[PDB]
Paper text:
DNA gyrases are type IIA topoisomerases found in bacteria, archaea, and some eukaryotes (plants [Evans-Roberts et al., 2016] and plasmodial parasites [Dar et al., 2007]) and are capable of relaxing positive supercoils and introducing negative supercoils into DNA as well as performing other topological manipulations. Unlike eukaryotic type IIA enzymes, which are large homodimers, gyrase is an A2B2 heterotetramer formed by two GyrA and two GyrB subunits. The GyrA dimer forms two gates that facilitate DNA passage. Here we present two different oligomeric structures of Streptococcus pneumoniae GyrA-ΔCTD forming an open dimer complex with a 44 bp unbroken DNA oligonucleotide.
The Tetrahedral complex, built from six GyrA-ΔCTD open dimers, was formed by mixing GyrA-ΔCTD, GyrB, and the oligonucleotide in the presence of ciprofloxacin and novobiocin. A negative stain 3D reconstruction of the complex formed in the presence of GyrB indicated that this complex is comprised of six open GyrA-ΔCTD dimers assembled with tetrahedral symmetry, but surprisingly no GyrB was present. Collecting tilted and untilted particles (673,694 particles), imposing tetrahedral symmetry, and masking out the central density improved the resolution to 4.0 Å. A reconstruction with imposed T symmetry, with a mask for the protein, and excluding the DNA density at the center yielded an excellent map to 4.0 Å resolution according to the 0.143 FSC criterion. The final map consists of 12 GyrA-ΔCTD monomers related to one another by tetrahedral symmetry. In the assembly, GyrA dimers are situated at the two-fold axes of the complex and make contacts at the C-gate domains, whereas the interactions between neighboring dimers at the three-fold axes involve contacts between the N-terminal tails as well as interactions between the N-terminal tails and adjacent tower and WHD domains. In addition WHD and tower domains interact with each other. For example, detailed comparison of the Tetrahedral dimer with the closed dimer shows that the largest conformational change takes place at the N-terminal tail region and the exit C-gate, leaving the winged helix (WHD domain), tower, and coiled coil domains moderately rearranged. The Tetrahedral complex provides a higher resolution structure of the open GyrA dimer whereas the Dihedral complex provides the structures of two anticipated intermediates in the reaction cycle. Although GyrB is not incorporated into the Tetrahedral complex, it must be present in the reaction for complex formation and therefore has a role in complex assembly.
Numbering used by the authors:
A (entry chain A): 4 to 232
B (entry chain L): 105 to 360
C (entry chain A), D (entry chain B): 361 to 486
Write the structure that this text describes.
């Protein structure tokens, strides 16, 4: 019992809201408008500013995470590399935004050693996610070092929530992965944008539902209908 | 023993190197055992610890308070000890000294490595209200060779800024190719003497390169002041007047 | 936002090219003021005073290359100027009608669908 | 040979600057021909036909910047032109008199003698 600081009503409310919102944003459930976690957003934007696209061969991931640490996201190096590994696996993640280079894991459950052993770069889908970014598309903010600028939300070109899902940590509130087939999703986007009132049965006509990265069998169209209602 | 470097280095563990108190901790602990500050019983109920160390110089202004926000974080205004003590004397003499007249006394941030401080307006804002920001421009100078390829001599990086990360950031900004004109960087010391030459080529005014490295790198940064600390058991944002009024009250308590 | 950005970029370029086009209109008065000038600031101030110009326009005129003072170059400037005003009218039509907004969205989404869309590895059973 | 080389270099630069100076003489006729031109080759051919110019001179005129069409710039061109003709006259005086040739030789040899000359490590005995 060391600190004896008493008069802490609104300051414990403000500090508690601050630490709770920092949990919810940084280490928890991602956004609607691009479906990407802030760790993931800083991964994609840092690898964009390094220009590590598929025209060049793969680069060492330790340098990318070090530039993430020095510019955008001052947190665990192994956590940033955990996001790197999970994003760059075909079974762990539906459409691999990062294309890697080296041993990452297996469906049996395996991990890479560290960020300085294997290489990575952006795949053909991150260039889609970052096409037309530098053109007053999404407002930047100043980050923790007040010299770098980061994007608030990545300007998506395909809705990545339905594609890749949101795994969630509950501090009361957790969230799940509905994956989707990209083409049926885009057709659903087209039909919603055409008719402002399409019934969800008529979009279950469009969307089957969970397009898993390894395939399965889905039992229950009733729970599917409950979910998309 | 080996503790670290300004480049960013750490000692191995607590069992490799030695330590003791310096000449200032004996000041901080002079006249402690004499009913000076009330003890409390700690977690083992046999040892007694002091609540607050009886200071003999106000150590907030000297060393600053780095802060972790759970909503509330706090900053480092360091100060020169002699001007601080003279400020304490003038506050204890006249109970109403204006903060301009203490900025007459106190310049402001006395860094452990030296720098250049831009902005006396942010300094005045800080020692009036507590919240503010000043600008930290490194001690850089332009030295023109007779040959023609000019010189930027940088000697004083600002408070808690790496050397190695800044020089790697400069070389990267050369190879990020947003602006050119930097020839090379000479890091001409191992541990001794902080004076480092970065070359600007022929036919390039090095004040342009200097302003651009001040814009980009961690060589001229911002630095916030928010003097937040515990008074009477609560955290409060306090001014330079209030810190020294409270310190004078505490030394009156110590002396009595 | 992307359409407004490209309209800003093309509108600034058309503004500069319109300033050079006004320079091509009355070349002789501009030359007469440049010959009567003493500093560059005087020259650009008197051009902006005489032909209602901007700082960008006057800098473009005072940095205009003399080789570009021909009908073989006025043709290229005038054609490119009409093309950029056509692009401005196109982007204003995009910003005026939300139908074409949805159309651009459909087109680029179908481009993505062509470039990537596989089918379901999972079978919906009953 | 070095003096003739620097006379060649300064003479070529003075030739180009003289072509631009003739452009500064009658600016209006040059502008009138550029406005009447259709290709760059036509413009340079008609300028060389009308003011007895060279290919280097006509390329310098058709690449002359319009900001350089001021008395604040004609002063710099005219002063630098007189300075380069003074340098040409100096190098012609060097090429005309072998005394100054020996003088330049003496000066640079004494410069070397200042920069390096030690004395005899060997003693001449008898």
């Amino acid at each position: 019992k060391n600190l004896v600081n008493v008069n802490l009503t609104k300051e414990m409310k403000a500090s508690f809201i601050d630490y709770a919102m920092s949990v919810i944003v940084a280490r928890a459930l991602p956004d609607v408008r691009d479906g990407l976690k802030p760790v993931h957003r800083r991964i994609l934007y840092g690898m964009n500013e390094l220009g590590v696209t598929p025209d060049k061969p793969h680069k060492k991931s330790a340098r990318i995470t070090g530039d993430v640490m020095g510019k955008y996201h001052p947190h665990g190096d192994s956590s940033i590399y955990e996001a790197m590994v999970r994003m760059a696996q075909w079974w762990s993640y539906r459409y691999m935004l990062v294309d890697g280079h080296g041993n990452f894991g297996s469906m049996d459950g395996d991990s890479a050693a560290a960020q300085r052993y294997t290489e990575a770069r952006m795949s053909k889908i991150a260039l889609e996610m970052l096409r037309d970014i530098n053109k007053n598309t999404v407002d930047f903010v100043d980050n923790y070092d007040a010299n770098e600028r980061e994007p608030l939300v990545l300007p998506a070109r395909f809705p990545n929530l339905l594609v890749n899902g949101a795994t969630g940590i509950a501090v009361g509130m957790a969230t799940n992965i509905p994956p989707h087939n990209l083409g049926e999703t885009i057709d659903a986007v087209k039909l919603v944008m055409d008719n402002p009132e399409v019934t969800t049965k008529d979009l279950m006509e469009v969307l089957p539902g969970p397009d898993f990265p390894t395939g399965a069998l889905v039992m229950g169209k009733s729970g599917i209908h409950k979910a998309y209602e | 023993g080996n503790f670290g470097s300004m480049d960013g280095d750490s000692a191995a563990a607590q069992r490799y190197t030695e330590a003791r108190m310096s000449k200032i901790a004996l000041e901080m602990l002079r006249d402690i055992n004499k009913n000076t500050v009330d003890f409390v019983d700690n977690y083992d109920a046999n040892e007694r610890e002091p609540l607050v160390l009886p200071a003999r110089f106000p150590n907030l202004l000297v060393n600053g308070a780095t802060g972790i926000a759970v909503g509330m974080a706090t900053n480092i205004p360091p100060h020169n000890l002699g001007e601080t003590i003279d400020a304490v004397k003038l506050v204890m003499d006249n109970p109403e000294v204006t903060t301009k007249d203490l900025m007459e006394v106190l310049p402001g941030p006395d860094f452990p490595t030296g720098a250049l401080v831009m902005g006396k307006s942010g300094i005045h804002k800080a020692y009036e209200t507590g919240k503010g920001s000043i600008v930290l421009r490194s001690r850089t100078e332009i030295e023109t060779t007779k040959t023609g390829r000019e010189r930027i001599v940088v000697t004083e990086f600002p408070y808690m800024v790496n050397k190695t990360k800044v020089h790697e950031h400069i070389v990267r900004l050369v190879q990020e190719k947003r602006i050119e004109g930097i020839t090379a960087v000479r890091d001409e010391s191992n541990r001794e003497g902080v004076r480092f030459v970065i070359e600007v080529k022929r036919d390039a005014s090095a004040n342009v390169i200097l302003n651009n490295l001040f814009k980009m790198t961690q060589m001229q940064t911002n630095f916030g002041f928010n003097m937040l600390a515990i008074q009477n058991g609560i955290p409060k944002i306090l001014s330079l007047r209030q810190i020294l009024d409270a310190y004078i009250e505490h030394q009156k308590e110590v002396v009595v | 936002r992307r359409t407004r950005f490209d309209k800003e970029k093309a509108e600034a370029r058309a503004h500069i090219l319109e300033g050079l086009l006004i320079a091509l209109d009355h070349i002789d008065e501009v030359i007469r003021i440049i010959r009567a000038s003493e500093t560059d600031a005087e020259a650009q101030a008197e051009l902006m005073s005489k032909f209602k110009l901007s700082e960008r326009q006057s800098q473009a005129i005072l940095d205009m290359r003399l080789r570009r003072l021909t009908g073989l170059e006025r043709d290229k400037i005038q054609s490119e100027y009409d093309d950029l005003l056509a692009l401005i009218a196109d982007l204003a039509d995009i910003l005026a009608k939300p139908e074409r907004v949805s159309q651009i969205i459909k087109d680029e989404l179908d481009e993505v669908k062509r470039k990537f869309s596989d089918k379901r590895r999972t079978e919906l059973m009953v």
